[PDB]
């Protein structure tokens, strides 16, 4: 995760 989707 991290904020790509």
Q: Distance (Å, rounded) from C-alpha 1 to C-alpha 5? A: 8
Q: Which residue has the tokens 């904020």?
A: 3
End-to-end CA distance of the chain: 8
Q: Distance (Å, rounded) from C-alpha 1 to C-alpha 4? A: 7
């Amino acid at each position: 995760y991290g904020g790509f989707m």
